[PDB]
Design a protein around this ligand. Sequence first.
Ligand SMILES: *[C@@](O)(COP(=O)(O)O)[C@@H](O)[C@H](O)[C@H](O)COP(=O)(O)O
Ligand SMILES: *[C@@](O)(COP(=O)(O)O)[C@@H](O)[C@H](O)[C@H](O)COP(=O)(O)O
Ligand SMILES: *[C@@](O)(COP(=O)(O)O)[C@@H](O)[C@H](O)[C@H](O)COP(=O)(O)O
Ligand SMILES: *[C@@](O)(COP(=O)(O)O)[C@@H](O)[C@H](O)[C@H](O)COP(=O)(O)O
Ligand SMILES: *[C@@](O)(COP(=O)(O)O)[C@@H](O)[C@H](O)[C@H](O)COP(=O)(O)O
Lengths: 255, 250, 250, 251, 250
Amino acid sequence: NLTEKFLRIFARRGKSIILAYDHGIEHGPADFMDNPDSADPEYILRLARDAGFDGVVFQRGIAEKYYDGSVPLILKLNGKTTLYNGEPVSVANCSVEEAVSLGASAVGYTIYPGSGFEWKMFEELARIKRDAVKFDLPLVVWSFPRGGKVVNETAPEIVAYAARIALELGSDAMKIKYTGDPKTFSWAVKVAGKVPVLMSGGPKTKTEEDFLKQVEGVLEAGALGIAVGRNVWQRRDALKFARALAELVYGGKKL
Amino acid sequence: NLTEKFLRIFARRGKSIILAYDHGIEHGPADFMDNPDSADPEYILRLARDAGFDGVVFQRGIAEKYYDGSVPLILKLNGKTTLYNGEPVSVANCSVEEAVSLGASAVGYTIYPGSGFEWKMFEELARIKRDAVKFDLPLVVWSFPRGGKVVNETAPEIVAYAARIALELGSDAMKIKYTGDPKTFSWAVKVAGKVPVLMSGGPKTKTEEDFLKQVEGVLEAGALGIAVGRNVWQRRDALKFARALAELVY
Amino acid sequence: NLTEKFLRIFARRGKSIILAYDHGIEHGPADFMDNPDSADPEYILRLARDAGFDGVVFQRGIAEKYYDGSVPLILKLNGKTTLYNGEPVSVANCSVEEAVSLGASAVGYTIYPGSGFEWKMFEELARIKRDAVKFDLPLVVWSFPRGGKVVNETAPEIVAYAARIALELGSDAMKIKYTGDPKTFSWAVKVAGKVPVLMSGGPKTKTEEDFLKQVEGVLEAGALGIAVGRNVWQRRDALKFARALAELVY
Amino acid sequence: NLTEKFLRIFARRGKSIILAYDHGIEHGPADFMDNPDSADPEYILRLARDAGFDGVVFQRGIAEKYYDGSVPLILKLNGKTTLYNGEPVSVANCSVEEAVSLGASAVGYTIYPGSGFEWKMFEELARIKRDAVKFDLPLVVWSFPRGGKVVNETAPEIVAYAARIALELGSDAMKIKYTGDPKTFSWAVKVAGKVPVLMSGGPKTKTEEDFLKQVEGVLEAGALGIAVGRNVWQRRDALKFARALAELVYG
Amino acid sequence: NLTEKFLRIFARRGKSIILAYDHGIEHGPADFMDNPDSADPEYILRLARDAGFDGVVFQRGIAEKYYDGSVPLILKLNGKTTLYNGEPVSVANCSVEEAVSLGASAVGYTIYPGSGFEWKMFEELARIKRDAVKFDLPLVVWSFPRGGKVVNETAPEIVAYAARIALELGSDAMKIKYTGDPKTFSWAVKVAGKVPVLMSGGPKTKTEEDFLKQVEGVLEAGALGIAVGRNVWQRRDALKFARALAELVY
Ligand SMILES: *[C@@](O)(COP(=O)(O)O)[C@@H](O)[C@H](O)[C@H](O)COP(=O)(O)O
Ligand SMILES: *[C@@](O)(COP(=O)(O)O)[C@@H](O)[C@H](O)[C@H](O)COP(=O)(O)O
Ligand SMILES: *[C@@](O)(COP(=O)(O)O)[C@@H](O)[C@H](O)[C@H](O)COP(=O)(O)O
Ligand SMILES: *[C@@](O)(COP(=O)(O)O)[C@@H](O)[C@H](O)[C@H](O)COP(=O)(O)O
Ligand SMILES: *[C@@](O)(COP(=O)(O)O)[C@@H](O)[C@H](O)[C@H](O)COP(=O)(O)O
């Protein structure tokens, strides 16, 4: 059971915080100017360690050149850029077998349900899923409806759809966008059934409190925890704030 | 003879009811709000068993996480979403070999004849068909003409075309839309020949009576049975009504 | 030599009549309304056998469920529908190896020279040709230019082009549309060289005499014979007229 | 060295004449009406043999039904039609391995640099080049820029680009369009470096002398010779003219 | 560690100059009219040697016919032409295995982030990267964002994105456009992390002084060196200028 393996490794305390760092490809280095140290993957590793987080997410080139075994690794297999203008598509730049050699404990893959290319991502995910089972690595799906009829990616019915698709396609854990409230987000958590849900952190919030309140909602809705990037490492007080998130998520008490 | 195998497993009583549950990918969870328990695959398995139905239809993720061997399984290999706006296409997210591993007794695959992508699904069905034969699992084709010249999907000449295409491409059973009346639907059944036909249940009908009436015509047209989702599990009295369907069909 | 093999099997008398029956996918069951018995592949086989024809053409599904070894079989590997609106393209739904297992004595494949997808069909035909040689099964190509700059499919220069292309790509026999007269048709036969040409029967003619006259022209042009569907089995006197065709051709 | 092998087989006399016959697919049989025997591949083989030419170019269907080993064969692996209206593309209908079994002494492949589909041909040529090396058959590239920014295919800078691309991609010999004069054609020959250049014959010229003058310019430019189709087999005096071409190129 | 192997071979003095010569395909022979000896690859090899440069970049055809082992070789695996009008795309015409056989000490590949085809190059670079590791050849990525939203290829944010993408995808060294000043270029150098950066030379500058100032700024920004073509071999005094470059860099 790969969900069980995922939980043992990335959620030993009953909840999970994953430090996300595929941003160098997805958005590029404009994400790193706020807190320049954030451009250094070594800083990101020390940050995940010192904050007591469960994992990091790296693309293959970052894992190859920097990964040191110090925090469990989710190797994000596919990536695209924001420079790209077509219907959304993100293709694997790494195999599951290569992810094993690079020290990963899980693999990650983004799908964009609704895209004119949804078929292209589903077809490749099928091959990656088969390899995840073969190599006994949990498959984590970033499920981000985009393109086609999608006009509001955080609408309740869009996020619930995102969650259900990830279940249906064989994910062992998933990452979806937050709806902005616990009632509608708990519907997504429910339809995902036995597969645990991680909240995608999103653009840096106006205040730290705004983020903490979102995280409380996610936990209220019954999600497993968060896969957070900017709302930690785009902050000059990254470590102090990361520590406050750890206490909220692992501590389990009402703000 | 994989048709014979299909009949032995899924129509031991001479007729067949299959509980369809690929909707979580095809339509998403809005389908589940009318009767919230329907979002739980375990509730679906209990419903199929408790009504004495012949099979269930699951995508790979649902089968992997929930399938317990209690009712025969058709593993639906391809899925698409309603969020998608292109020429209709649905590609495999699972192989026949993996379906075998997940405990499937048959595999399912949707084609959309007429789509700008009709060639992509025919190409893929060729490989899936070859594998179905290799692993001795019946191949059940959902034949749903869509895109291209198709305007009315339930028009009698489209449904009959759907039936013929499924026969021609090598299906061992098929699922097609109802035309709304037994005489026109019996032509589709006729052109399917040796291959048994299941009626796609469709959107929940205004009254329970309306649906029973449709199932009556389906059987009268000589079809094998029904592959039904919403018209059972979107109802709050799902189990009671499923038992009434079992009484009618068998 | 696979042309020689094709002639021994399908032209033992020196000329050939092939009963074509891929219509179920290509046009759908509308083709069967004229003579409803034609929806039944058992009736088609009986018809070919009774009239003394040389072969039958089935898609894989029909061959698998109905072929009984009674008449030599050309397995038509690719198929498309009339519901489809893009640039013309027909992909294989069956392999040469599978066709051999289905009892085929030859394999068939349609190309649409000129189509925006001509590259896709030429690519796939290369694989099929390779397998046809490997399995020693003659390759029969339906060469039907369509799409691109093709305005009139029965223009003398289009049909001759269709014939040359089938020869160049490595067909062992070919099926092409008739130009309407023997003089221009004989140019198409000439440019096909050593590869025998079968006339595509086309839409059912206004009279049985019209068709007989076309067939007479085809023979005068030096063609091997005919691959006929509708002009036989769309007729209520199917057997009688098939026998008059045997008379004329043999 | 496959260029050296190509030269030994197809240019033993120092220059080369190859009789090209892929027209039946590229242009269709209207090319054959002027001289109806030209529709008969047996006639083409006899023509090349009787004129003393170095080779013939056939698509797989023609080689399979007709090739008799009598003249060295270049197996033209890809073909497209003039009925096709999309971005110029021509895909292989035959593998290198099959070409070997059909008697080929070399393989041929057309690319259309500039096409919206140039990537599809480069990707395929890569596989064919790998197989050519594997089976030790020289690879002859018809480098015909077409589509994209290409307007006049015989413009000096286009023909030179065609020549250089064929060198860069790994051709062992190449066939390109003539610019219409020896000075500009010689720059194309130079940028091709160690790879020998054959002139594509083109549409039948107004007079025989017109074509002879073009050939003289091609030879003046330092090209290896000509890959000629229509300017021979479209003529009712095909063999007579073929022998005059042999005298010019080999004398 | 393929970056350390790249550095040992192509940067033994601590900084690198690579003589780039993929122009014959990328731009065609118009690049060669200024200094026509530049059309001869033997002239190019002698130049690199005489100038004391670290390496040369050839496409497979040039390497196969001309490479003599005299200077270390980066085999540039993909190439496209300026004649092409679609969304930028450049596919492999050579495999890593073949590059090994041709005497390559490294392999090169261009990506165009932002292109409507960026996915096609990412998919292919993945197979190339896997082979580079298997054959122990460093992978050098030319990262040139182009198409999509890209309007100024030398903008600070675009060149930094270029650099970071090359690091993310697995390059062992990279080649990127210069931003025109050392401050903005050093940010691209920093985001590349452990992966060394080479400056793409670009079109021939108005004066020798102009190019020298740019090279000075490239070094000031902490880059490894330059991969230069036109700014050396388009000049009549190619060798004199090449040695002035060697004096500055080393
Ligand atoms: C990237 O942020 C890309 O997401 P989109 O910008 O395309 O919506 C994600 O793949 C991250 O892995 C994930 O969202 C967590 O990072 P964040 O900074 O949002 O917390
Ligand atoms: C889904 O209903 C999808 O069908 P369309 O909405 O694309 O026409 C089918 O794949 C079902 O498996 C089948 O129709 C039976 O379920 P229903 O709820 O229609 O009875
Ligand atoms: C189908 O008739 C399809 O032909 P098109 O409608 O696309 O032109 C052919 O593949 C038949 O196999 C062949 O033409 C012979 O049948 P016919 O009914 O025309 O005699
Ligand atoms: C065909 O002529 C096709 O060329 P395009 O009409 O597409 O330019 C070539 O492949 C010939 O092999 C070559 O041009 C030699 O024949 P020609 O008749 O031109 O002398
Ligand atoms: C070619 O110059 C292609 O570059 P673009 O014209 O597409 O931007 C490069 O691949 C060169 O290899 C590299 O830029 C070095 O050559 P240069 O002449 O620019 O110094």
